[PDB]
Symmetry: C2
Subunit: 303 residues, 2 copies
């Protein structure tokens, strides 16, 4: 058994705010955690062949609550972070992070699958990162990525996930339904208002260090769709900045060439039980290749 | 004398690529370095009064070269980083970072002002961050920030900068000239082509954790201006991604309210001595308040 990684974190400018910095930090922590627990340098990974292999983001969840959500975090906040990986075979790995306020009751507690999957606590942030090793099929192409595994990836002795907690069932349902919250879920009503935004890939902002669309830029693009729909509903920019995201799920179905024009579609369901509570679904399409490259659902509270 | 901070850094997704992630990481390292050397928690700083005080970016330089520039950095690269602060009084502080490739000849060498200011080496990256303590003059206003100093800020015993190496002369000339490279510099020719881009503040991307425009977003906005001018010159997006920035200087003259519409102006001078070498100047204006809020010069090499 490789130990879980606990760290004390003082919130820095580069990991908070209304943008994608927090997600970017979470992803860096996933690569550090897999590197420590799977005896592999994820940052410099190469397949047996010698080609770079990327531990690509595939399913990403951030679950908080009114007591602690990503927008709670300001400069200098003291957090505790507990991280660990779970066996998903040789081509994929699940990494969990729990984030608590430092000196909160039982912040030293270890990872608990039952807590993450069945009894999440309002006041902790729960992060699930399901990642898949991929290589490019052609240099300079971001399409048709190929499954891989770096030589010496040690998934053996990683703790096991029970069948109930499978991220594969979760993301399979999202690719089919274009939501992580089934449309027949009681207590919601679909608004007739939707948006469809043409988004050229932003080569200034959203390209990563290996020439793919940057995983955190998917969260920026989803929020661009969400803001477009917020504005179409006649709500204020000021109010968008006060929006509380208590849960968000993202599936990365594909990457995209850097000259692509993407389409960002957004729809919303409002709670009939709780004022201000709504489910926003965003689908990112690459019309020219015929592909859905992302699905995201946000569970929000606003005023 | 507080020791300089040396660290071994493996390049992570969250600190490289064609965007502003590297600058964002540099800034976080500046706050960590000042915190260690000035016995102050910069992240959670408060003035005597109890109001949050921010160690705001004011003058920022990144100098590399063909052998090592920010676009050299890819996932898993091994670097050494050496960092230290220099006395600029109680209201400001200068932080330097040198970045070398790990196992490069004499990467263990300490900071050397003469090297940074007079004999920079092609193959090292030199970072200068001149930062000023500020508070808001009114809650929810990003204009008319006020000079501050947190109680217990220890600038005493920080090493001294000689008069020759003053960042104040450098940024004073840039606010006046709207360039860091004097217009009468021999060996360049101003192109007639310029751009002026209207840029509404991007509330999805560019807001920091304390509701200011995020310092790294200034580099994104400058590159948005630079790309607009690149396109007006009929150059390809592909070629913009291959652009080498061997030197860049930024002055943060002001911040801006989150409903502002900024103006990004860009002009370029081409080398008459070296094909592909050009100086791009970007000025960021807040027309509605009558303020120049940023100036940047980039020294570039392209193909
Ligand atoms: C670290 C990092 C990233 O991870 S950027 C990459 C973000 N994630 C992605 O682009 C994953 C995109 N997904 C895919 O390309 C495909 O879904 C896979 C994983 C290759 C699976 O492909 P298929 O659906 O074709 O399944 P197959 O049956 O071929 O197996 N970064 O810094 O940007
Ligand atoms: C850490 C961080 C940041 O630093 S964002 C802030 C970036 N920097 C700025 O906004 C600095 C803007 N500059 C200013 O507001 C002004 O130039 C100062 C520093 C208050 C100086 O003001 P004045 O020119 O009015 O000079 P005065 O004579 O009043 O002194 N972040 O995460 O975004």
């Amino acid at each position: 058994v490789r130990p879980e990684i606990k760290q004390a974190v003082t919130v820095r400018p580069g990991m908070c705010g209304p943008g994608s910095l927090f997600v970017g930090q979470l992803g860096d922590w996933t690569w550090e955690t897999v590197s420590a627990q799977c005896d592999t340098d994820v940052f410099a990974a190469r397949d047996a062949s010698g080609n770079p292999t990327y531990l690509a983001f595939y399913y990403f969840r951030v679950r908080g609550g009114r007591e602690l959500h990503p927008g709670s975090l300001t400069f200098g906040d003291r957090l505790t972070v507990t991280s660990g990986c779970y066996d998903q075979g040789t081509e994929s790995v699940l990494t969990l992070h729990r984030i608590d306020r430092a000196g909160s009751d039982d912040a030293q507690r270890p990872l608990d699958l039952h807590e993450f999957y069945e009894r999440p606590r309002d006041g902790s942030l729960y992060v699930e990162n399901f990642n898949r090793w991929v290589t490019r099929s052609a240099p300079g192409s971001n399409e048709d990525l190929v499954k891989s595994s770096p030589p010496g990836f040690r998934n053996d002795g990683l703790p096991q996930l029970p069948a109930a907690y499978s991220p594969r069932a979760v993301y399979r349902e999202a690719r089919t339904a274009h939501t992580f919250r089934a449309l027949d879920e009681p207590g919601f009503r679909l608004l007739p208002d939707t948006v469809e935004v043409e988004h050229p890939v932003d080569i200034v902002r959203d390209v990563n260090g290996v020439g793919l669309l940057y995983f955190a830029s998917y969260f920026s693009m989803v929020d661009k769709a969400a803001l477009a729909l917020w504005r179409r509903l006649g709500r204020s920019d000021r109010a968008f900045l006060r929006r509380v995201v208590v849960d968000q799920q993202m599936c990365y179905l594909g990457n995209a060439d850097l000259d692509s024009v993407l389409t960002l579609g957004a729809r919303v369901r409002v709670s009939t039980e709780t004022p201000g509570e709504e489910l926003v679904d965003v689908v990112i399409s690459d019309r020219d290749s015929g592909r859905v490259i992302a699905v995201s659902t946000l569970h929000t509270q606003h005023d």
